[PDB]
């Protein structure tokens with residue numbers, strides 16, 4: 153008999169910081185003779201370079217598939233009034249230098265040598281602009297811009313269509329529009345406070361960053377490891393050991409470093425495959441839950457999905473999956489059919505509901521009793537074949553027209 | 557190309573090494589060469605496993621796509637093509653497949669004055685499945701995808717309560733189709 | 741099979757090598773057999789991951 | 790990348806410095822990524838910022854629907 157506002161958050165990493173280290177300085181440092189020795193050993197360094205370039209381009213493809221899904225850039229209207237709803241928590245703040253939402257700024261603040269790193273092609277500013285454009289598209293134009301050109305639609309019409317997608321009429325939305333807006337604002341504030349009070353909410357990105365840091369530290373330690381040699385420094389060996397000698401020592405050092413770096417490359421590309429699967433799932437979530445209304449069960453969060461409000465995140469993306477969860481149930485009498493004039497009557501779109509005295513019709517998700525008439529019911533078969541049928545009359549609206 | 561590398565040996569040919577070097581160290585050189593080729597093969601087969609896993613994942617994704625929007629019609633939006641998908645005719649490919657997806661795209665948009673419902677006879681006439689539009693002086697009901705004007709009647713509109721709680725309603729007459737039969 | 745393999749060493753048991761061979765080159769044989777066991781086990785854990 | 794060309798028409802970006810490109814204030818679409826939102830394309834060589842897309846921001850109306 154009552155509606156409860158529901159919203160759940162989801163965390164999905166997208167990409168990590170790509171790295172590219174030259175093999176010669178990584179293994180042999182500045183030794184020219186070591187480079188000459190590894191020249192004829194094989195084309196392993198070319199394979200590593202090709203692999204890292206492939207990882208970089210597939211991470212870029214994953215990022216542009218997750219974020220850059222629209223060919224048009226949308227800007228929010230200056231009038232921040234859509235019938236009474238609040239959009240300050242999701243709209244970017246012009247006063248902030250990062251041009252991000254307060255929730256986006258909060259999640260950015262929460263998320264915190266012989267090696268080189270490459271910055272991403274698209275920084276957080278363009279991702280934030282893409283998210284703001286798609287939020288403007290899904291607010292002002294709804295899902296019309298998803299399947300073609302952007303078409304203006306009223307926001308109450310958007311909630312009415314979203315409620316009718318799951319089987320809720322617009323009369324209860326019209327009756328409690330202010331209540332719906334107040335409940336949505338209260339839920340948004342509550343989840344904002346919960347995200348501000350939860351340091352482990354974004355634990356997936358922190359886990360990925362910590363795993364990368366542990367991997368690079370372990371590889372640095374393996375570089376510092378002697379691997380069962382006289383010393384871990386090639387220059388001291390060259391300045392002390394015989395130049396005809398120590399060839400086997402430096403060969404075992406470089407092949408141990410090669411084994412360590414190939415283990416690192418294999419685990420990095422397997423983690424890249426894992427994050428590619430995660431980015432594919434995120435892309436499906438963008439294509440189905442975000443651009444339009446998805447009727448899929450338990451795909452866009454807990455409960456009946458209404459709309460989702462994705463936002464930019466460092467090395468990932470967040471999910472503001474606003475859903476609907478019913479509450480305040482009550483016992484009611486059930487009958488599969490109504491026996492009127494020897495014929496069985498069935499509800500066209502609802503279920504027969506009674507409190508013990510009078511039989512009515514209501515939807516399966518909300519308690520909206522209505523007078524059982526001829527237009528909202530269809531008649532087929534008889535009463536003896538069906539089981540559980542009860543006796544009641546059916547009002548005919550056509551009769552009083554010609555009764556007078 | 558991995559077979560044409562010395563791998564730390566004096567030469568890439570093994571028969572000459574066996575003929576020249578003493579077998580006590582020739583066997584060590586042969587062991588080093590074959591174990592280096594063994595790491596080459598293990599890297600190649602690990603790359604093959606990664607490629608096979610990626611190909612299997614892509615094949616599973618394609619199987620889900622063809623189960624959704626090839627055998628029938630998928631109600632999901634933008635799952636297998638931009639816009640509203642209608643039908644698809646996929647074609648064969650060597651060691652692959654191509655999905656020829658046909659979609660529906662609207663065109664020729666036009667502005668229309670709209671109202672949430674119609675306040676007539678002290679009651680609100682909400683649309684059952686359409687949306688009310690106006691061209692400036694007359695009101696019509698249309699769908700959410702195509703401009704199909706129609707006179708607002710009692711069959712296509714349902715009434716649930718009065719027309720004062722709602723915001724932004726307008727006043728317009730509702731034609732009852734049952735009246736003209738007994739009007740005469 | 742990998743732990744039972746000699747991996748080009750003299751014996752698969754370190755006790756016989758320690759009690760028979762001199763301390764020179766015994767650590768070389770031990771290192772060779774254990775690193776064969778290593779490369780086998782990193783390959784193994786790669787297929788299991 | 791990663792350094793400045795002063796300590797080696799040069800334009801210096803966050804990712805690095807590119808030699809032989811002329812910076813243009815107009816923003817176009819590039820085919821070869823570089824990094825940090827900087828894009829370069831042939832025709833000597835023009836350097837610019839990657840275009841996000843076409844700009845279209847229709848005014849929101851609570852009484853007008855663009856029905857096709």
Ligand SMILES: *[C@@H]1O[C@H](CO)[C@@H](O[C@@H]2O[C@H](CO)[C@@H](O)[C@H](O)[C@H]2NC(C)=O)[C@H](O)[C@H]1NC(C)=O
Pocket residue numbers: 153154155
């Ligand atoms: C559904 O439950 C909510 C929560 O109790 C009701 O909202 C309350 O409404 C009363 C008066 O209508 C207010 O005094 C309270 O402040 C409201 N509480 C909250 C948390 O909003 C709502 O009225 C219920 N729905 C119906 C149809 O009765």
Ligand SMILES: *[C@@H]1O[C@H](CO)[C@@H](O[C@@H]2O[C@H](CO)[C@@H](O)[C@H](O)[C@H]2NC(C)=O)[C@H](O)[C@H]1NC(C)=O
Pocket residue numbers: 232238239240241
């Ligand atoms: C939307 O919600 C925000 C957040 O609560 C509202 O901003 C508050 O406004 C009051 C005055 O109306 C101030 O006292 C608070 O300090 C503001 N809070 C924050 C976090 O800025 C805002 O008024 C609401 N309405 C609109 C239209 O934005």
Ligand SMILES: *[C@@H]1O[C@H](CO)[C@@H](O[C@@H]2O[C@H](CO)[C@@H](O)[C@H](O)[C@H]2NC(C)=O)[C@H](O)[C@H]1NC(C)=O
Pocket residue numbers: 507508509510
């Ligand atoms: C079951 O619900 C119906 C619908 O509200 C009730 O019928 C009305 O009840 C009110 C007060 O309860 C009366 O003022 C109306 O005159 C009743 N209308 C009709 C057509 O009977 C009915 O009383 C309820 N029954 C029980 C046992 O609670």
Ligand SMILES: *[C@@H]1O[C@H](CO)[C@@H](O[C@@H]2O[C@H](CO)[C@@H](O)[C@H](O)[C@H]2NC(C)=O)[C@H](O)[C@H]1NC(C)=O
Pocket residue numbers: 491494541542543
């Ligand atoms: C619902 O009403 C029908 C008739 O409107 C009832 O059918 C009658 O049942 C009695 C005894 O079971 C017979 O003597 C009559 O001849 C039946 N009438 C007809 C027209 O067949 C039916 O029993 C009622 N249901 C319940 C649960 O009482």
Ligand SMILES: *[C@@H]1O[C@H](CO)[C@@H](O[C@@H]2O[C@H](CO)[C@@H](O)[C@H](O)[C@H]2NC(C)=O)[C@H](O)[C@H]1NC(C)=O
Pocket residue numbers: 691692693694
């Ligand atoms: C809105 O549409 C209605 C329905 O077509 C128009 O009413 C007719 O308009 C035509 C010419 O536009 C006249 O020839 C008919 O006589 C009109 N019908 C009646 C019953 O008078 C109406 O003119 C349109 N209004 C606008 C502003 O375009």
Ligand SMILES: *[C@@H]1O[C@H](CO)[C@@H](O[C@@H]2O[C@H](CO)[C@@H](O)[C@H](O)[C@H]2NC(C)=O)[C@H](O)[C@H]1NC(C)=O
Pocket residue numbers: 675725726727
């Ligand atoms: C639609 O018609 C109703 C009914 O006449 C209008 O409601 C009247 O509004 C005036 C203006 O304040 C009041 O003096 C009357 O008492 C109202 N009548 C009733 C029965 O409540 C309403 O204003 C009309 N709306 C439009 C947009 O024309």
Ligand SMILES: *[C@@H]1O[C@H](CO)[C@@H](O)[C@H](O)[C@H]1NC(C)=O
Pocket residue numbers: 481482483
């Ligand atoms: C219906 O009545 C039963 C019997 O007391 C009770 O166990 C159940 O909780 C009731 N359900 C509702 C929704 O009131």
Ligand SMILES: *[C@@H]1O[C@H](CO)[C@@H](O)[C@H](O)[C@H]1NC(C)=O
Pocket residue numbers: 665666667847848853855
């Ligand atoms: C509707 O009117 C607005 C405001 O004049 C305009 O911006 C928009 O392009 C119009 N749309 C159509 C389809 O005519």
Ligand SMILES: *[C@@H]1O[C@H](CO)[C@@H](O)[C@H](O)[C@H]1NC(C)=O
Pocket residue numbers: 231233234723724851852
């Ligand atoms: C549409 O919005 C404007 C300003 O936000 C408001 O003045 C107007 O009354 C709204 N339209 C309706 C029908 O309420």
Ligand SMILES: *[C@@H]1O[C@H](CO)[C@@H](O)[C@H](O)[C@H]1NC(C)=O
Pocket residue numbers: 791792793795801802803
């Ligand atoms: C550019 O060169 C200046 C020296 O004039 C130096 O201070 C600065 O750090 C360089 N920029 C970068 C990104 O290194």
